[PDB]
Amino acid sequence: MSGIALSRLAQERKAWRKDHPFGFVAVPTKNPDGTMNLMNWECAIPGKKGTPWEGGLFKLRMLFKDDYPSSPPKCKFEPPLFHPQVYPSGTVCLSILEEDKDWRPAITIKQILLGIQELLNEPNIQDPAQAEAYTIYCQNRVEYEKRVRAQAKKFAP
């Protein structure tokens, strides 16, 4: 009974295709039979120019639950990224991606992808999702930025 979610996602696809930020990618995956799987999207976020993430293209998957948009989609970097707000599993943490926080059925895929891009160079360190990146960020900022640059070069398209 995913009808409502599918109706919304079909429109989000149309909107995204009509206009989206340059360098970004967001496309529904395909089912084995060739049809579109609007509940599972393959996306890519470009690093912000002027930041240590510049040049990198970070792939992530957006998974929508049957009750969307009552619930936010689950966004996971594939592969997992080195960042204080990214779980070792790859799941990204953002207030707008939490049903009990700032998620609102109205939030768009564009807003989410732009929000995650913003998060990349501006990590909210108050409540980290991984101990490794948080520890380095806090104990040696230069080393942290050094690892970020290496990672950005690694995922350069």
Binding site: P88, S89, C93, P128, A129, A131, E132, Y134, T135, Q139
Partner: protein, 157 residues
């Protein structure tokens, strides 16, 4: 006389001592150290009975050493996963899965204070532990003495 399962089910200083003079070996022997989650559980249950009294302090410390030596000395044991799950169960790091953080961190902090001074402890884990024990948190703030002690010890690792 007592048994390991009964102790783990309902931990108490008395039950630990009733395990006998070989209690340390028994705790490690009866714990499936191939599973980080189970090692975290055993570590927390054992440390939960810590009391700053000779017989109990020795019993808890010895148990922790036997357990952690066994766990850490498995070349397959993921020490990073142990640290992460430990922090999650102590309520110091968020997780994707739901876990009810333990109520009192006194014992766990005192047990850790002892553990990080042992040869079997992977020093690479010290910075991560330090990062999350120094990070603001009400549970730790109410366990000031134990928290300060552990941090002072971590400075020496």
């Amino acid at each position: 006389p007592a048994d390991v399962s009964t102790f783990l089910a309902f931990p108490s200083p008395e039950k630990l001592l009733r395990l006998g003079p070989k209690s340390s070996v028994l705790i490690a022997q009866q714990t499936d150290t191939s599973d980080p989650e189970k090692v975290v559980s055993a570590f927390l249950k054992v440390s939960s009975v810590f009391k700053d009294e000779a017989t109990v302090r020795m019993a808890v410390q010895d148990a922790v050493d036997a357990l952690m030596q066994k766990a850490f000395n498995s070349s397959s044991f993921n020490s990073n996963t142990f640290l992460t799950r430990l922090l999650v169960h102590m309520g110091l790091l968020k997780s994707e899965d739901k876990v009810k953080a333990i109520a009192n961190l006194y014992g766990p902090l005192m047990a850790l204070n002892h553990m990080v001074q042992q040869d079997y402890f992977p020093k690479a884990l010290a910075p991560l532990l330090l990062a999350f024990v120094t990070k603001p948190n009400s549970a730790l703030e109410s366990c000031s003495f134990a928290r300060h002690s552990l941090l002072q010890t971590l400075y020496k690792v």
